[PDB]
Design a protein around this ligand. Sequence first.
Ligand SMILES: CCc1cc(Cl)cc(CC(=O)Nc2cncc3ccccc23)c1
Ligand SMILES: [Cl-]
Lengths: 297, 302
Amino acid sequence: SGFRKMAFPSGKVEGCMVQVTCGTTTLNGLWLDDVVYCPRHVIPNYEDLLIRKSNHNFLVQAGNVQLRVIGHSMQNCVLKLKVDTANPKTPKYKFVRIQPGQTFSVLACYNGSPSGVYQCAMRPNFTIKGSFLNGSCGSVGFNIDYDCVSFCYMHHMELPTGVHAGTDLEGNFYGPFVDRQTAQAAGTDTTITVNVLAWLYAAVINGDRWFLNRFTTTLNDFNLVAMKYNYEPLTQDHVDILGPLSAQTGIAVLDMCASLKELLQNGMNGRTILGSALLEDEFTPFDVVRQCSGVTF
Amino acid sequence: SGFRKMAFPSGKVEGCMVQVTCGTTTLNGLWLDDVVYCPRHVICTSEDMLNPNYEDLLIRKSNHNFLVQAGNVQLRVIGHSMQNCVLKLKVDTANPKTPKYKFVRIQPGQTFSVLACYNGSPSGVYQCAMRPNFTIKGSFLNGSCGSVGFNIDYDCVSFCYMHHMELPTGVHAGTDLEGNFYGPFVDRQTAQAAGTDTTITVNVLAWLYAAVINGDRWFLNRFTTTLNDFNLVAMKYNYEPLTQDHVDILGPLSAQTGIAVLDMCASLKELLQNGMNGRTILGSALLEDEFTPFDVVRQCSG
Ligand SMILES: CCc1cc(Cl)cc(CC(=O)Nc2cncc3ccccc23)c1
Ligand SMILES: [Cl-]
């Protein structure tokens, strides 16, 4: 029993964190094989700024060992520093771009040193509601599938609202953001509907049933109600994804939708679900299965 | 900016997780140097649950009864001893991945990270607080026994918890790494109930200071309170009494934000009286009590 916002074990990613210093800026790098990846803002015309840099300008530190940079290239908003040594601790990895609603773990680092791990969701407005201080740039978001680390995020900046913006590991920003000091605002956020439903299934698996009702709804009637409460549209794909949870608990997806519809129009009435007074949307349907069945890494 | 329930990086602890099998029972072990630590109930049978004699059960075991597996390598048990409710299996190989570590017993209200494992394999990491009733509200399934709670302050891992059992309410009970249970709990399947839980007041206040540091001020009021008047109100809402030690501990946050502890106490008194009124504090509609004053300073400063 129990439901917690659980992150993936961070060990495979900790073995990749390095400190990258260029001039006055110090941030984090992801050392995989003989390449160190980091935000290009460590060096604006970035092609022009990068052509003025030499390999010895970037001081890369892996623990108490200095890595010598033997090349540098830029891919979108990510800087790739070719180093002489391949990271022995390099795990089986992939660079994956995630979609909004998808969750991932963040290993927050300061000076190439991991200090915390937390679980995040890519908001529908493409920002993450992270926890970052100055120096966290280059910190990475990841998932683990079997023994493979899927790197999906690199932290680049904090928006004026305290939310975070970054890129995938190929340097492509999530959201309409740019890596420079200018007026940039996060768009109006919406609730990840499929994730709230998955979390309602997790509450039922944990014995919380007060919100369940005898009613069902059509997907269209649910989406008309969801739109009114700033909830993301629930697609037929989402229903199919929720299928195993629907089968396990005996509550049809449109039947849980009718519970969610009532929860939105009426509220919780001083009641809680999994110790929360808000509807939680940072657990995907897969996260609920993984946590409520026991998958290990 | 931003406030998250953050766990310590689990890598140093992952390098210590092993699988311990004794008969039909398989649980987790913590392999540090040449010793594997695990709950002593790994040696219990079906009829040795209600009233087991662990000294008697352990004397009947030989080193070859304990199958210890570290990854795909079997470790050779060369000795066994029991310290309170933990079993110590001396092995023939010292763990190369053994970090700089300490065994620390924590007090209620204290937080720690839990590395949940099944079959000696880490599957997730989450943040926990030792509840005032000495239970933890964890997320554990069958096979999680032997999973550990820790804090990684600087480069040293302070092991503070080992999971042992789930109480009838879905809450969890375990020991420190010396085998001493937290609370009035025993490793027997006898009727055991967690005591009435209370809110860790000092932690809610620390989290209110975290919200102020993050720009949230709506809950602040023009009032202050005496420590006694605050406790008289706090008790009525099942909040732990706030001691002078707690007031002292909140001192740095009080100095950083400019809000006196008894002033922040009057804000908490009002929040208990009024509720949130459809508002949130740090994205939460409930008062959060699993962030200690030390957690708030570490996350909001470094
Ligand atoms: C009542 C008998 C008993 C006494 C003792 Cl000394 C130990 C256990 C084992 C136990 O509680 N294991 C588990 C841990 N966490 C969560 C669990 C969820 C489901 C099933 C087991 C779970 C059981
Ligand atoms: Cl403590």
